[PDB]
Design a protein around this ligand. Structure first.
Ligand SMILES: *[C@@H]1O[C@H](CO[C@@H]2O[C@@H](C)[C@@H](O)[C@@H](O)[C@@H]2O)[C@@H](O[C@@H]2O[C@H](CO)[C@@H](O)[C@H](O)[C@H]2NC(C)=O)[C@H](O)[C@H]1NC(C)=O
Ligand SMILES: *[C@@H]1O[C@H](CO[C@@H]2O[C@@H](C)[C@@H](O)[C@@H](O)[C@@H]2O)[C@@H](O[C@@H]2O[C@H](CO)[C@@H](O)[C@H](O)[C@H]2NC(C)=O)[C@H](O)[C@H]1NC(C)=O
Ligand SMILES: *[C@@H]1O[C@H](CO)[C@@H](O[C@@H]2O[C@H](CO)[C@@H](O)[C@H](O)[C@H]2NC(C)=O)[C@H](O)[C@H]1NC(C)=O
Ligand SMILES: O=C(Nc1ccccc1)O[C@@H]1C2CCN(CC2)[C@H]1Cc1cccnc1
Ligand SMILES: *[C@@H]1O[C@H](CO[C@@H]2O[C@@H](C)[C@@H](O)[C@@H](O)[C@@H]2O)[C@@H](O)[C@H](O)[C@H]1NC(C)=O
Ligand SMILES: *[C@@H]1O[C@H](CO)[C@@H](O)[C@H](O)[C@H]1NC(C)=O
Ligand SMILES: *[C@@H]1O[C@H](CO)[C@@H](O)[C@H](O)[C@H]1NC(C)=O
Ligand SMILES: [Cl-]
Ligand code: NA
Length: 526
């Protein structure tokens, strides 16, 4: 089964999915390897080939540091790369339904990982279920992360910043030029991504260069206005320079700094990325998107505020316990191996961990807003507050503010509150509905009866998969057949959102409303 693309032929493979067949093209190159003199530059266009490119296994993941905090723990290692790290990593994957479709809606996945980590080839990013069940084509790509993907000397094309975002953009282009040969409709392309992937999606809504490359957008636990999502030009240069010094590449001619940083090995650059910041947090994005003047022409919050984005529908949502995942990466008193009952003193020390460069009065004002308990004798109060602090501040409140702001310019938006905890979730129970653990439901892993999921979970996945597919195809995330709860548009007055769970799907109004006035109004002033 061979498909002719604009650059040459590619041979895929057949997969047996639910007594059916998906055709998989795994590891198709979509740019010149950003190697040698090409490191830190925008992706260069790919030179044609004449052979049959054998896109029959996932390609290299991009160079990155690996989570080594829990060796042998599936809860952390399910996210570590599962192919060789290599600078040669600009590849994508395509899952098409068999029999080859005529004009199928295309779903493009963008992974997260704090812009430092991630790869398309992970078990929970497998698009064969969606292809099999919903007759959509699924595409995913590897893009450069960390400094190799986001080092920034503004202006200077030898390190302009946002390389990783231009990698994604190049893959969106590849879909535009080639997906029709796979049976896909380039006029019906939904981007979707989680975490930093979701912030990437929202940044494609603002990038003029991407406005013609997709139709609709889905943002899972992420948006560009989250406090980790955009590196300032000050930080970007202090961090570029502190990488120079850390590698002995401190020079004056800022181009020779890059030429020097180019003869370093990826490892030399990888192991110094951690220390370019004086104080980090589990949520540190040392090298991320910047206002480069190319992909991003102004501070994105201004573009958002003043309506400078692609006018289309969005699906946005967040999980019930976004914060907890990061508490076990540094917060005192927290462990995945006990119930992490922390004290007032421990909660205070945890704030110093997550808000290190914040005034005493600023930390005092977080504590104040989060320690007015109904019952002051509940030992988990401080444990849950700190998770909620990280979750509200880093994910939930910015997603809500993005959705209010975006819908004020007239487009349909739909907001969800995923609040089911997987029966297979390998982290402990006090960590709740964790950051990242709707993804497997989105991709339909519970649709495999063999995969050790409950029947209730198969039904929730099936409803989510249909809602996502219906949003992609028709911009309306309804499940119209099984008397499902209808999903109302998020208007900026009523702010209705849909809860996703295995029990009762419900329509609620104005999520974390008291909490988000704090983060969105008061706290930016400190
Ligand atoms: C801008 O960078 C300087 C230099 O960073 C230091 O050197 C790097 C290569 C790396 O090793 C970093 O961890 C170092 O901090 C920062 O200045 C340092 O700030 C810390 C605390 O803020 C202080 O204890 C050090 O003595 C400082 N070192 C020097 C040489 O000034 C500086 O804070 C950065 N500016 C920011 C973050 O606004
Ligand atoms: C929960 O565990 C934390 C983490 O401690 C580590 O992990 C445990 C599973 C166990 O193997 C411990 O021996 C490990 O140290 C505990 O935090 C420690 O608490 C003590 C005093 O309470 C303090 O001196 C240590 O510095 C802490 N260590 C760390 C790494 O934070 C915590 O006490 C445990 N809490 C409960 C309620 O069970
Ligand atoms: C809605 O419920 C119906 C059953 O009442 C589901 O339709 C079945 O779907 C499964 C696989 O998804 C097939 O094995 C069956 O043959 C289908 N038909 C029947 C008559 O059972 C449908 O999947 C549900 N849709 C949702 C939850 O979106
Ligand atoms: O969101 C981030 N990183 C992150 C880092 C800095 C700032 C913002 C975001 O985490 C990832 C992500 C994708 C894979 N899975 C699921 C969601 C997580 C694995 C993990 C979780 C906590 C700490 N480190 C790694
Ligand atoms: C494929 O369909 C094209 C029109 O696409 C339509 O509009 C977009 C926005 C999507 O929402 C999608 O569902 C619609 O079908 C036609 O112009 C094109 O000629 C068709 N090509 C085929 C059938 O080969
Ligand atoms: C591509 O796959 C075919 C089919 O198995 C094989 O014969 C051919 O040698 C492959 N090409 C390579 C490995 O370059
Ligand atoms: C910096 O070095 C580059 C590389 O040779 C050169 O092209 C550029 O003009 C230099 N700029 C200066 C010296 O300001
Ligand atoms: Cl209100
Ligand atoms: Na260019």
């Amino acid at each position: 089964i061979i498909i002719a693309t604009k650059n040459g032929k590619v041979r895929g493979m057949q997969l047996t999915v639910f007594g059916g067949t998906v055709t998989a093209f795994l590891g198709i190159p979509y740019a010149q390897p950003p190697l040698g003199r090409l490191r830190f530059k925008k992706p260069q266009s790919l030179t044609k080939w004449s052979d049959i490119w054998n896109a029959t296994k996932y390609a290299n993941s991009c160079c990155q540091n690996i989570d080594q905090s829990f060796p042998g723990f599936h809860g952390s290692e399910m996210w570590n790369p599962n192919t060789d790290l290599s600078e040669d990593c600009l590849y994508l994957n395509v899952w098409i339904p068999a029999p080859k479709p005529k004009n199928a809606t295309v779903l493009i996945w963008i992974y997260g990982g704090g812009f430092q980590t991630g790869t398309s080839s992970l078990h929970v990013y497998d698009g064969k279920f969606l292809a099999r069940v919903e007759r959509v084509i699924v595409v995913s790509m590897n893009y450069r992360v960390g400094a190799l993907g986001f080092l920034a000397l503004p202006g200077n094309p030898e390190a302009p910043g946002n390389m990783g975002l231009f990698d994604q953009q190049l893959a969106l282009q590849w879909v535009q030029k080639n997906i029709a040969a796979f049976g896909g409709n380039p006029k019906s392309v939904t981007l979707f991504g989680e975490s930093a992937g979701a912030a990437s999606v929202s940044l494609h809504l603002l990038s003029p260069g991407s406005h013609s490359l997709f139709t609709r957008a889905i943002l899972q636990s992420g948006s560009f206005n989250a406090p980790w999502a955009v590196t300032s030009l000050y930080e970007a240069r202090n961090r570029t320079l502190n990488l120079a010094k850390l590698t002995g590449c401190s020079r004056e001619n800022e181009t020779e700094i890059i030429k020097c940083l180019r003869n370093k090995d990826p490892q030399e650059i990888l192991l110094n990325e951690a220390f370019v910041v004086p104080y980090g947090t589990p949520l540190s994005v040392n090298f991320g998107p910047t206002v480069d003047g190319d992909f991003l022409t102004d501070m994105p919050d201004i573009l958002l505020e003043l309506g400078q984005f692609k006018k289309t529908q969005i699906l946005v949502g967040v999980n019930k316990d976004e914060g907890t995942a990061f508490l076990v990466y540094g917060a005192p008193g927290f462990s995945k191996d006990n119930n992490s009952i922390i004290t007032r003193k421990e909660f205070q020390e945890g704030l110093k961990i997550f808000f290190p460069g914040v005034s005493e009065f600023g930390k005092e004002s977080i504590l104040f807003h989060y320690t007015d308990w109904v019952d002051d004798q509940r030992p988990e109060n401080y444990r849950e507050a700190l998770g909620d602090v990280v979750g509200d501040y880093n994910f939930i409140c910015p997603a809500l503010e993005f959705t209010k702001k975006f819908s004020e310019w007239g487009n349909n938006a739909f907001f969800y509150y995923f609040e089911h905890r997987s029966s297979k979730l390998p982290w402990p129970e006090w960590m709740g509905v964790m950051h990242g653990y709707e993804i497997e439901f989105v991709f339909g892993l519970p649709l495999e009866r063999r995969d050790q999921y409950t029947k209730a979970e198969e039904i929730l996945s099936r409803s989510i998969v249909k809602r996502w597919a219906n949003f992609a195809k028709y911009g309306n995330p309804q499940e119209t057949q099984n008397q499902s709860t209808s999903w109302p548009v998020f208007k900026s007055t009523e702010q209705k959102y849909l809860t996703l769970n295995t029990e009762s799907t419900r329509i609620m109004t104005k999520l974390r409303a008291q909490q988000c006035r704090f983060w969105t109004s008061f706290f930016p002033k400190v």
